[PDB]
Design a protein around this ligand. Structure first.
Ligand code: CLA
Ligand code: CLA
Ligand code: CLA
Ligand code: CLA
Ligand code: CLA
Ligand code: CLA
Ligand code: CLA
Ligand SMILES: CCCCCC(=O)OC\C(C=C=C1C(C)(C)C[C@H](OC(C)=O)C[C@@]1(C)O)=C/C=C/C(C)=C/C=C/C=C(C)/C=C/C=C(\C)C(=O)C[C@@]12O[C@]1(C)C[C@@H](O)CC2(C)C
Ligand SMILES: CC(=O)O[C@H]1CC(C)(C)C(=C=C/C(C)=C/C=C/C(C)=C/C=C/C=C(C)/C=C/C=C(\C)C(=O)C[C@@]23O[C@]2(C)C[C@@H](O)CC3(C)C)[C@](C)(O)C1
Ligand SMILES: CC1=C(C#C/C(C)=C/C=C/C(C)=C/C=C/C=C(C)/C=C/C=C(C)/C=C/[C@@]23O[C@]2(C)C[C@@H](O)CC3(C)C)C(C)(C)C[C@H](O)C1
Lengths: 63, 155, 50, 188, 92, 171
């Protein structure tokens, strides 16, 4: 996946499970959840983005 | 085949419908219609003669061949002829309608079904005569049905 | 109200058929003038070619 | 799956207008206005076109047989009558009522046995998994039809057309005995 | 006493108002769904729902008169229903 | 390609493994059930009809069983069945035929479909076994007499009921 990709979230406890989001930044380091995905729908706290791991995103559309 | 007779043509074909349904089935149906009509005209005139089949009763009563196919139906004689003709014609239905609009009609599209028992003549004059009398008896039996529905006797 | 109602039913049915077929999928505002060659009011009914 | 285009059964008289024709079938796709054969794409609950073809072939065959029975029972031609059994009810739809249980119970029994024993692969249909079965291919008259493609398809199209007409007719003789007038020229 | 049986001689009862309401309710639902699709496809979906785009809303509202045909076309085309793996679901 | 119908193909599955195969299957009935069942049915029917023809033409001309008494069975073979049903002897005949049919028919039809033996042996050779040419000739003669006496018994019964049997052993 790359920055600007459209991904589908596979984390079951996430608010955006099986929902589409846009990759914002992939950090290159020791981070356990490096990929930053921004969503168009806020969750119950009202937070739009979240940090996700590389195996929790299923990918939909290339940049 | 058979052309006019003394000129050479495909006969009178003004409608030209020989290029619509295949000529093999046309020739087979022509021969079957004609042979049916030949037996029909002979049986008609023989019943009008007074000749009787070996099975007696109700056959001389329903004479003139017009109450024949209204009283022999209820007498049960007509059903036996229907089923015998039906079984032979369903053997023919197999051997003929297995091939139509397609796969070859290599049985001689006429009288090729058996029949090589007594004569073994196989004359071309016999074939030409067979088709000619076939259609002559078609018109003859049409006349014998229609004229005798109002006239009687020999006309 | 004086005329039979079946006459009206058949007339409205024929008009319904005519205008269902005169624009096969071109109902609604967003779908009719999608082609930039359909000028308004031109249903193609000009047999005499005026 | 088989996407309804190779299935024989399209009709020329639904392409009767200028444009479109053939031997007896319409060229641009068979008739399906409600797109009922495309309903397998959304949900597997809807049957495949193979199951629909088997259903209409069975309906058409039973309807030919039924309308022929209606045409023959309605005026004469009844089986000879013996003891404890009379085939005399010339009125259709009431003939099984005046009939002993050894006769009406034997038609249904043999129909059920023949239906159950020819039901091998109907549920391999509903999903397009033909392999065997091949819609209506019970075996009664296979290898009897022509071995080429055009004549066999013509024969099948003849079967489908006659069948559909019979369906519409047996349902015109019915719905007219129920309510008076669904067929103007009725005779029954 | 109204007979909601479905008999033809009592079709002036429930059945004919049933057909009328089903048509009108499908009209309302299809108009709402069409305007929802349009407002989703815009740049400010939230502001198009508290402040209605009245010309477009009237367009969908009047064009929802053929809802049983348009809904059937969308059902056959596969645009009426989400596959099911794309809608969010609780962990269970 | 056939021999009894030399104008319309040759029936499938009638290659000639069974005796007397001239290819007479115009309806194609050799596909509903296995040919071993059909050959077993033909042979059983033929044996029953040959015994039936012999019994009918022997009883009808006049012969009575040991202590067969004097009833309407003794009048003719026409009323012999309705006489012996009431006397219950047909129940004993049905019991004997049912016992032999259980053993013979169940074994004979169960094992051809499994695969084990010729269609209709029963192994009661009663003499001629070594001359296999005579075995196949006797198979052909058996099936020919089978068909002939199926026709013969049908003709006998239909002739007798068509005139209600006015005491005619030529009929
Ligand atoms: C299809 C065969 C068949 C059938 C249905 C009948 C039926 C009948 N026969 Mg008959 N019969 C037959 C063949 C047959 N016969 C043959 C081939 C002959 C030799 C010519 C006779 C000679 C004969 C005479 C002389 C008389 C009859 C009589 C009768 C009647 C009463 C019989 C009775 O009480 O038996 C029920 C009682 C029994 C004890 C049953 C018999 C059991 C035997 C053994 C048969 C069992 C099966 C057998 C072993 C065959 C299996 C072969 C297998 C091993 C391959 C009845 C209508 C009598 C009658 O009333 O007529 C006026 C009579 O007088 N029959
Ligand atoms: C009804 C049976 C019948 C059938 C199947 C045929 C079939 C045929 N005939 Mg034939 N024919 C018939 C009756 C029939 N004919 C009769 C009654 C006569 C005497 C007038 C002739 C005289 C005749 C001649 C002289 C020749 C043919 C030829 C042909 C062949 C090509 C022409 C064709 O297809 O048009 C026939 C098509 C039809 C009969 C279809 C029926 C059309 C309507 C329903 C009939 C008219 C209604 C009413 C009676 C008038 C074809 C095999 C030609 C041939 O052998 O080509 C090599 C040829 O030379 N026929
Ligand atoms: C009209 C065409 C036709 C022709 C040319 C033949 C010719 C023949 N048939 Mg045949 N057959 C026919 C129609 C025909 N059949 C029909 C319509 C039936 C059904 C009723 C039969 C039923 C039949 C049987 C059951 C047998 C023959 C047999 C035979 C062959 C021996 C001759 C004989 O006994 O004749 C018989 C003619 C009519 C019964 C001979 C090749 C025999 C055979 O194959 O011998 C080797 C034989 O066993 N045929
Ligand atoms: C009377 C006119 C007539 C003529 C000249 C023919 C001529 C012919 N027929 Mg034919 N046929 C006719 C009427 C006629 N048929 C009728 C009315 C029927 C229906 C029963 C048939 C049924 C028929 C069959 C089923 C077969 C023939 C066959 C034949 C051919 C050879 C047999 C033969 O020499 O027959 C001579 C015929 C007569 C001398 C007529 C008898 C006159 C009576 C007794 C009066 C020959 C072309 C065979 C054939 O072509 O094989 C390839 C064949 O299989 N025909
Ligand atoms: C048992 C009924 C039945 C069934 C299952 C089919 C099935 C089929 N037909 Mg068919 N057909 C039928 C009856 C039926 N037909 C009758 C009676 C006619 C004559 C009007 C036709 C005329 C016809 C043509 C001309 C063509 C087909 C075609 C087809 C195939 C694709 C269309 C499709 O998906 O239809 C699915 C059909 C159904 C699921 C039947 C259910 C019907 C609805 C859902 C419920 C009942 C409504 C109905 C109006 C009942 C009111 C009363 C009624 C008696 C009038 C398919 C195999 C096409 C084809 O051959 O493709 C290769 C094609 O071109 N059909
Ligand atoms: C006239 C209507 C008609 C037509 C054209 C056909 C045509 C066909 N049927 Mg069919 N069928 C029909 C009515 C019809 N059927 C009816 C009413 C029933 C119910 C009893 C059946 C039951 C049936 C079964 C169970 C099977 C067929 C099969 C077939 C096909 C193989 C060829 C064959 O045996 O038919 C030849 C047909 C004719 C020459 C026309 C019939 C002649 C007249 C009407 C007879 C009147 C008596 C062929 C497409 C088989 C198939 O689909 O395999 C591919 C198959 O398994 N049919
Ligand atoms: C046009 C919009 C629309 C549509 C198509 C639907 C469709 C549906 N709703 Mg629903 N709903 C809506 C608006 C809509 N809703 C709104 C605004 C609310 C909040 C009040 C709800 C609250 C609601 C609940 C609580 C439930 C449904 C359920 C359902 C389903 C069953 C039908 C039903 O119970 O209807 C009943 C619908 C209502 C009670 C609400 C109607 C409110 C108005 C009249 C509709 C809105 C029209 C809108 C303002 C038009 C503006 C568009 C214009 C600019 C063009 C169905 C999928 C049920 C379900 O899940 O079943 C599977 C269910 O339990 N809905
Ligand atoms: C056709 C049946 C349906 C119709 C009924 C019927 O026919 O009517 C009955 C009827 C009389 C009558 C009627 C009335 C009572 C007078 C009045 C009725 O009016 C009503 C309805 O009230 C009408 C009618 C006509 O019914 C007359 C019917 C006569 C009929 C049906 C006669 C069949 C002989 C068969 C034979 C000789 C076979 C021999 C076969 C033989 C000998 C062989 O097996 C040879 C064999 O080589 C084979 C083939 C294979 C080889 O391996 C083995 C061998 C070598 C052995
Ligand atoms: C009133 C009316 O209308 O109806 C009437 C009609 C009618 C016909 C007149 C009537 C009658 C008479 C009937 C029904 C008579 C039926 C008689 C019947 C059926 C009698 C079975 C005997 C069994 C035997 C002999 C078994 C022997 C067994 C033997 C000999 C063995 O060795 C067995 C064996 O085991 C050993 C010992 C050692 C083993 O290692 C080897 C084997 C297995 C071989 C009735 C009753 O009156 C009714
Ligand atoms: C296998 C075996 C044995 C055995 C055996 C057996 C039982 C062999 C039996 C052979 C048998 C019993 C074969 C019958 C044929 C009957 C026919 C051909 C009938 C023809 C009848 C015809 C052709 C016509 C009849 C007519 O009625 C018609 C049609 C109309 C009437 O108007 C005129 C007449 C009446 C004439 C052994 C050796 C005994 C012991 C060994 O251990 C085991």
């Amino acid at each position: 996946i790359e920055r600007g990709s459209k991904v589908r979230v596979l984390r079951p406890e996430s608010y955006w499970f099986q929902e589409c989001g846009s990759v914002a930044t992939i950090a290159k380091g020791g981070d356990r959840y490096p990929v930053v995905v921004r969503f168009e729908k806020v969750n119950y706290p009202g937070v739009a983005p979240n940090n996700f791991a590389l195996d929790e995103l299923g990918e939909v559309e290339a940049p | 085949k058979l052309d006019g007779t003394l000129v050479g043509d495909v006969g009178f074909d003004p409608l030209g419908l020989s290029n619509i349904l295949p000529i093999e089935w046309m020739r087979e149906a022509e021969l079957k219609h004609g042979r049916v009509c030949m037996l029909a005209v002979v049986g008609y005139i023989v019943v009008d003669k007074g000749l009787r089949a070996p099975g007696a009763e109700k056959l001389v009563a329903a004479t003139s061949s017009f109450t024949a196919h209204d009283a022999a139906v209820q007498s049960g004689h007509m059903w036996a002829l229907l089923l015998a003709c039906g079984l032979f014609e369903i053997v023919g239905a197999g051997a003929i309608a297995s091939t139509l609009n397609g796969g070859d009609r290599k049985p001689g599209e006429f009288a090729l079904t058996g029949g090589f028992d007594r004569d073994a003549a196989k004359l071309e004059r016999f074939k030409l005569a067979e088709i000619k009398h076939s259609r002559l008896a078609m018109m003859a039996f049409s006349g014998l049905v229609t004229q005798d529905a109002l006239s009687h006797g020999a006309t | 109200s004086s005329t039979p109602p079946e006459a009206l039913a058949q007339i409205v049915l024929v008009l319904s058929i005519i205008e269902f077929n005169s624009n096969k999928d071109k109902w609604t505002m967003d779908t009719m003038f999608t082609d930039p060659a359909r000028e308004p009011g031109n249903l193609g009914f000009d047999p005499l070619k005026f | 799956r088989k996407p309804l285009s190779e299935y024989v059964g399209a009709s020329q008289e639904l392409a009767a207008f200028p444009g479109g024709g053939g031997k007896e079938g319409a060229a641009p796709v068979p008739w399906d206005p409600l797109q009922l054969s495309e309903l397998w794409k959304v949900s597997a609950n809807n049957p495949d076109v193979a199951w629909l073809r088997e259903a209409e072939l069975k309906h058409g065959r039973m309807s030919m047989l039924a309308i022929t029975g209606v045409m023959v029972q309605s005026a004469g031609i009844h089986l000879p009558g013996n003891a404890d059994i009379s085939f005399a009810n010339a009125d259709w739809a009431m003939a099984p009522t005046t009939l002993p249980p050894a006769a009406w119970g034997q038609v249904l029994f043999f129909i059920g046995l023949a239906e159950g024993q020819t039901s091998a692969g109907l549920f391999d249909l509903w999903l397009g998994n033909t392999e065997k079965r091949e819609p209506g291919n019970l075996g009664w008259g296979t290898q009897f039809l022509s071995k080429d493609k055009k004549a066999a398809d013509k024969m099948r199209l003849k079967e489908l057309k006659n069948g559909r007409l019979a369906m519409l007719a047996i349902m015109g003789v019915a719905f007219n005995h129920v309510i008076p007038g669904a067929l103007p020229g009725c005779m029954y | 006493h109204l007979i909601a049986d479905g008999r033809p001689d009592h079709a002036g009862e429930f059945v004919i108002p049933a057909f009328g309401f089903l048509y009108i309710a499908g009209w309302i639902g299809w108009a709402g769904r069409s305007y929802l699709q349009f407002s989703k496809k815009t740049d400010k979906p939230n502001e198009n729902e508290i402040i209605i785009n009245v010309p477009v809303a009237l367009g969908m509202m009047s064009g929802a008169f053929l809802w049983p045909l348009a809904a059937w076309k969308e059902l056959i085309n596969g645009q009426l229903l989400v596959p099911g793996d794309e809608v969010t679901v609780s962990p269970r």
